[PDB]
Amino acid sequence: QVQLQESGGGLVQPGGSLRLSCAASGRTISRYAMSWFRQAPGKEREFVAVARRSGDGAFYADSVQGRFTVSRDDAKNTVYLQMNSLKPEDTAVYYCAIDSDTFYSGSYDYWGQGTQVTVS
Amino acid sequence: DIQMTQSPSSLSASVGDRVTITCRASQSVSSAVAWYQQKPGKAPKLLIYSASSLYSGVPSRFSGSRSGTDFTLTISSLQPEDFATYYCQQYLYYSLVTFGQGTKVEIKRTVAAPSVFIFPPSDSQLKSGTASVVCLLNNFYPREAKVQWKVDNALQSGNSQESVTEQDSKDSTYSLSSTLTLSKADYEKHKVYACEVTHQGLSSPVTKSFNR
Amino acid sequence: EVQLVESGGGLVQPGGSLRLSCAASGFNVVDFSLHWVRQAPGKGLEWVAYISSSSGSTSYADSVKGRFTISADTSKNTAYLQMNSLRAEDTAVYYCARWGYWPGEPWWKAFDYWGQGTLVTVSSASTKGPSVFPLAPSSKSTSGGTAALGCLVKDYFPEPVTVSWNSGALTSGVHTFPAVLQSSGLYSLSSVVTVPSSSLGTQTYICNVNHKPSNTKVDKKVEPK
Amino acid sequence: NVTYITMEIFIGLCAIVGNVLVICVVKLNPSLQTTTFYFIVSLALADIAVGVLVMPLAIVVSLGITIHFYSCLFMTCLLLIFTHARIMSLLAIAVDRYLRVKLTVRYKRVTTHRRIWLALGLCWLVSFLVGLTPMFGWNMKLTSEYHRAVTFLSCQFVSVMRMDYMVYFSFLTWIFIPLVVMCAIYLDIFYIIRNKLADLEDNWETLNDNLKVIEKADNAAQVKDALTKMRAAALDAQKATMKDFRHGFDILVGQIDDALKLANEGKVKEAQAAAEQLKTTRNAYIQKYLERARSTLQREFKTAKSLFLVLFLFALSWLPLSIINCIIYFNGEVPQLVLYMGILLSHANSMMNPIVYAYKIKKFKET
Ligand SMILES: *S(=O)(=O)c1ccc(C(=O)NCCCn2c(=O)n(CCC)c(=O)c3c2nc2cc(OC)ccn23)cc1
């Protein structure tokens, strides 16, 4: 019943800065957490970042720590991902996932169709 | 009778971060709100009294404020010695003392998915009369992880006990141990025992399983 | 130096009795009101009782009203918390804290100095030696990476237990979990260690577990299954 | 032509006589000798100066007497130093008032008499520098080529004064921003005082309502929370400050603690009887200290509302002229009759100050 609207993507130069956004349909993500995932070609799906509810905190992975920034304007019902400092090994399709519970246990059953983010 | 609803129950921050803990009083308690720091295994230590006044010996990075029935503890330049549990007490009278639920301040770091291991019960335990299956969640951050015990695709809930270690000194991570305890008659009735682990750093849940 | 020392906290049966002695050293109990605050294991602080030895005024929490009696001795500089009809949820660490009298800044510094705390354990089980079982590595487990193994200390009633791996020589990757209280009144403790899989078949792993209340020394060897 | 001359002779004479009267009233009356009234003397002196030099300037420009370019520039810039002195003095009054309401005790000890002379010197220094800026090469000789060699011309405002300066530097930086800051300050004062008049009323109302809840009560459960509301109220009302004020609240909180001890023991009648001893402390102390505090804040609110009318009549006097000058710099046409009223209204502020003191402050009409 929930379709994740996927925006952003396209080719970006190394050292670039692309801004990705994921919008939900049908229900409001204000009381949930929004998680970002990547799919490297030839590899499995890898955790990028999660934005917790309100100002609880934004948790990032090891490879993207200090480079990325995930934020959410929950009134507009969309989570943003400030992707800065791009390396050529980040040519991965980026997805979104709705955490389906309050206690942040990681129940990802509402997935997004993905945004291809390729770097020269 | 007077409730002190402390707004943050889990708070992750690193060294140098500015944190804010909000305590809300159910009714007016005037300025009589105190803040305490309790390291694990130690007695609580007073930091702020009167909701703004710094106690003697407390470092100046701690500060307090009052906005009506809302009370706020702030640490401007957080240090490694500030990682403890923080309680808000209203002290309007001797007999009307109530504490807050406590704010654990833990170290923020990068998200690590758990390394899931499942352990069959040994033959030394099986002759004793009970069988306990232990699932290990190794080196995961953050703390919030859910372990489900699916036995022949049936959620065996209500009989599993989970123990979580404190946050490690070296790599600032957690470990979890979920033990599913059964009688031997109930253990031999089924064949496939699985441990499904969901974490915020996992795209799909990891189902480490074994058979008899 | 101003300090508070608690005593008299130990192991009691449900429905039993206990007396805790909060010995004040650097001050006088007629100048400061003395309070008892308990902390359940894994829970927050809870105010219990209150003595004002200058005026004789006592007050108790509604969970401890009618069953806990507080008193103070001016000559011995000690406040006493007498416990009657103890039950399971009274198992906590009981802290003694002092609080000044109205008026002035002694009143506004609420619980400035605390005692070190004493542990009251209310539980019907009796002292039991630990049962030790090895958590064997799987032969069909992850190969080439870290392999996990452990020993499960399952049934022991007095909580302090020390588990060491290879007599303390192995301390890298050792995760000794906190003891959880079972429905039988006994504690269970898992103690695991993650080792490289190449060292699985070449290095022995001895779970040296010591239970000093029961004087139990078990040397459990953990083998792959 | 002669309409403006006698209207400015009237404005000038009323402003000079009125403000020297204000200076006399402040000097003679020993109670009006604070820092705020010192800045009122500063404003009055500037107002006298404005009148003293509006009297020649109006007819001189009207008759078109040829004075030197720099002399006419001196006259106009002098008029601006006194005008901006008025704005800066009003800002000083606003800052003084804000500090007085915000810092009840700190402000008094910090602001020493020599420090107030330092502040006044800084005030008129800033006014001098700002107003004389056209004379420091920001005049018509700066950019205009025709107006760079002209000497001994008829003194006109268009001929000597850079309208660019008037719209941007004079109005936006120095007229507009201080009035915005000042208006924000006054609204903040009107918020802080009405919050202080509400909570002092709210702490008094809970100390009166719960006294009547106790006198109609049956069990100690509804008595125990009644004193809990008083003890929060008496602790909040204690933080409204010499030592006799807080000494009476220590008796009141202590008498609450004397009746909380009786209510904790189940004695529902000894707690009510001990709560009747609160009224002895309430009439001896809380009648006297709250009504002195309520009358002090009401005097502070009425003084701030009187000084706000000076700012509003200042903003009713120079904002019209500023809008007229705005059109000039934006190459629009302004009618002669419209402009003439604008300059009169800008000088009408000189005459409005003394009358406001007489109608608002009761110590001015008697002297
Ligand atoms: S008329 O011919 O009868 C006549 C002409 C001029 C005057 C007159 O009094 N001129 C002197 C300057 C007056 N004046 C100001 O005092 N101020 C305030 C300065 C702080 C202005 O802002 C003035 C101003 N004259 C003008 C004219 C214009 O545009 C034409 C803009 C602003 N401005 C009296 C009678």
Which chain C residue's Cα is nearest to D251? Answer: C103
Q: Is the dihedral of CA D348, D351, D354, D356 positive or negative?
A: negative
Residue D327 forms beta bridges with which residues? none
Given an 8 Å threshold on Cβ–Cβ distance, is C50 in contact with B94? yes
How far apart are the C-alpha atoms of C91 and C12, rounded to whole Å?
10
How far apart are the C-alpha atoms of D84 and D177, rounded to whole Å?
12
Nearest CA to ligand 1 atom 16: D343
DSSP C22-72: EEE-SS-TTTEEEEEEEE-TTS-EEEEEEEETTTTEEEE-TTTTTTEEEEE
Across the interface, of D250, D253, D264, the residue whose CB is closest to C59 is: D264
Q: Could you tell me how many residues make up chain A?
A: 120
Residues of D in contact with C53 (CB under 8 A): none
How far apart are the C-alpha atoms of B105 and D68, rounded to whole Å?
76
Most D CBs within 10 Å: which of B27, B29, B30, as the mutation test of the D interface?
A: B30
Rg (CA), chain C: 23
Flag whether A touches D (3+ CB pairs, 8 A cutoff): no
Residue C60 forms beta bridges with which residues? C49
Residues in contact with ligand 1 (CB, 6 Å cut-off): D 1, 4, 58, 61-62, 79-80, 83, 157-158, 321, 325, 328, 339, 343, 346
Residue B65 forms beta bridges with which residues? B72
The sheet that has A68-73: what strands, in order across it? A5-7, A17-23, A78-84, A68-73
Pairing of strands B85-90, B98-99: antiparallel
Of D25, D55, D53, give the one whose Cα is nearest residue D40. D25
| The two structure tokens encoding residue D302 | 């009425």
How far apart are the C-alpha atoms of C225 and C212, rounded to whole Å?
31
CB contact A120 to B (< 8 Å) = no
Nearest CA to ligand 1 atom 35: D62
CB contact B32 to D (< 8 Å) = yes
How far apart are the C-alpha atoms of C84 and C18, rounded to whole Å?
7
Nearest CA to ligand 1 atom 17: D343
Residues of B in contact with D257 (CB under 8 A): 93
- Domain extents for chain D? 2-144+153-189+335-365
Report the greatest alpha carbon distance in chain D: 99
Of C86, A69, A73, B1, give the one whose Cα is nearest residue D223. B1
Partners of chain C (3+ Cβ pairs below 8 A): B, D
My answer on whether omega of the bond before B114 falls inside 30° of 0, hence cis, is no
Given an 8 Å threshold on Cβ–Cβ distance, is D257 in contact with B27? no
Residues of A in contact with B8 (CB under 8 A): 56
Across the interface, of C95, C134, C148, the residue whose CB is closest to B122 is: C134
Q: Measure in Å the smallest separation between the Cα of A107 and chain B Cα atoms.
A: 7
The sheet that has B62-67: what strands, in order across it? B4-6, B19-25, B70-75, B62-67
What is the 8-class DSSP label of residue C90?
Answer: G
Most C CBs within 10 Å: which of D250, D256, D270, as the mutation test of the C interface?
A: D250
Mutate to test the pocket of ligand 1, among D157, D160, D166, D339 (most ligand atoms within 8 A of CB): D157
Residues of chain C with CATH 2.60.40.10: 4-122, 132-221
CB contact C33 to B (< 8 Å) = yes
CATH number for the domain whose boundaries are C132-221: 2.60.40.10
Pairs across A and B, CB distance < 8 A:
64
- Could you identify the residue written with the tokens 């209510």? D263
Please state which architecture CATH assigns to domain C4-122. Answer: Sandwich (2.60)
Flag whether C touches A (3+ CB pairs, 8 A cutoff): no
Residue B85 host element (H or E): strand B85-90
Given an 8 Å threshold on Cβ–Cβ distance, is B28 in contact with D239? no
Residues of chain B with CATH 2.60.40.10: 4-107, 115-211
Task: Write out the residue range of the structural domain in which residue A56 sits.
Answer: 4-119
Of B64, B1, B62, B58, give the one whose Cα is nearest residue B28. B1
How far apart are the C-alpha atoms of D325 and D166, rounded to whole Å?
7
What is the 8-class DSSP label of residue D282?
Answer: I
Residues of C in contact with D253 (CB under 8 A): 102-103
Count other Cβ atoms within 10 Å, centred on residue C168.
10
Let me know: does C106 contact C56? Beta carbons within 8 Å. Answer: no
Partners of chain D (3+ Cβ pairs below 8 A): B, C
Q: Is the dihedral of CA B98, B101, B106, B109 positive or negative?
A: negative
Given an 8 Å threshold on Cβ–Cβ distance, is D236 in contact with B28? yes
How far apart are the C-alpha atoms of B11 and B108, rounded to whole Å?
9
Q: Measure in Å the smallest separation between the Cα of D266 and chain C Cα atoms.
A: 12
Give the fold, CATH level 3, of B4-107. Answer: Immunoglobulin-like (2.60.40)
Residues of B in contact with D230 (CB under 8 A): none
Residue D181 host element (H or E): helix D177-215
Pairing of strands C118-122, C11-12: parallel
Enter the resolution in angstroms: 3.2
Q: Measure in Å the smallest separation between the Cα of C198 and chain B Cα atoms.
A: 17
Count other Cβ atoms within 10 Å, centred on residue B141.
26
Q: Measure in Å the smallest separation between the Cα of B54 and chain A Cα atoms.
A: 26
Q: Measure in Å the smallest separation between the Cα of B112 and chain A Cα atoms.
A: 7
Q: Which residues contact A110 (CB under 8 A, 6 or more apart)?
A: A2, A4, A24, A97, A98, A100
The 3 state secondary structure assigned to D103-144 is CCCHHHHHCCHHHHHHHHHHHHHHHHHHHCCHHHHHCCCCCC
Q: Could you tell me how many residues make up chain C?
A: 225
Partners of chain B (3+ Cβ pairs below 8 A): A, C, D
Residue C219 host element (H or E): strand C216-221
How far apart are the C-alpha atoms of C194 and C197, rounded to whole Å?
9
Nearest CA to ligand 1 atom 21: D343
Let me know: does C197 contact C208? Beta carbons within 8 Å. Answer: no
Let me know: does B147 contact B178? Beta carbons within 8 Å. Answer: yes
CATH number for the domain whose boundaries are D2-144+153-189+335-365: 1.20.1070.10
Q: Measure in Å the smallest separation between the Cα of D233 and chain B Cα atoms.
A: 7
Of D117, D118, D55, D45, give the one whose Cα is nearest residue D82. D45
Which chain B residue's Cα is nearest to D236? Answer: B30
Mutate to test the pocket of ligand 1, among D343, D345, D346, D349 (most ligand atoms within 8 A of CB): D343
Of B73, B66, B3, give the one whose Cα is nearest residue B30. B66
CB contact C40 to B (< 8 Å) = no
Cα(D343) to ligand 1 centroid in Å equals 6
Atom of ligand 1 nearest to the CA of D328: 29
Residues of A in contact with B205 (CB under 8 A): 106
Across the interface, of C47, C133, C188, the residue whose CB is closest to B97 is: C47
Q: How far apart are the first and last CA of chain B?
A: 55
| The two structure tokens encoding residue B6 | 């402390």
| The two structure tokens encoding residue B111 | 């998200």
Given an 8 Å threshold on Cβ–Cβ distance, is C102 in contact with D250? yes
Which chain B residue's Cα is nearest to A108? Answer: B203
Which chain B residue's Cα is nearest to D231? Answer: B92
CB contact D266 to C (< 8 Å) = no
As a dihedral over the C-alpha atoms of residue D200, residue D203, residue D208, residue D210, rounded to 10 degrees, the angle is 170
* Number of compact structural domains in chain A: 1
Pairs across C and D, CB distance < 8 A:
11
Let me know: does C21 contact C8? Beta carbons within 8 Å. Answer: yes
Let me know: does D73 contact D134? Beta carbons within 8 Å. Answer: yes
Give the fold, CATH level 3, of B115-211. Answer: Immunoglobulin-like (2.60.40)
Query: Number of C-alpha atoms within 13 angstroms, CB side, residue B168?
Result: 21
| The two structure tokens encoding residue B140 | 């995961």
My answer on whether omega of the bond before B142 falls inside 30° of 0, hence cis, is yes
Let me know: does B208 contact B135? Beta carbons within 8 Å. Answer: yes
As a dihedral over the C-alpha atoms of residue C89, residue C90, residue C92, residue C94, rounded to 10 degrees, the angle is 160
Supply angle C-alpha C198, C199, C200, rounded to 5.
Answer: 90
Most C CBs within 10 Å: which of D236, D255, D257, as the mutation test of the C interface?
A: D257
DSSP C99-118: EE-SSSHHHHSEEEEE---E
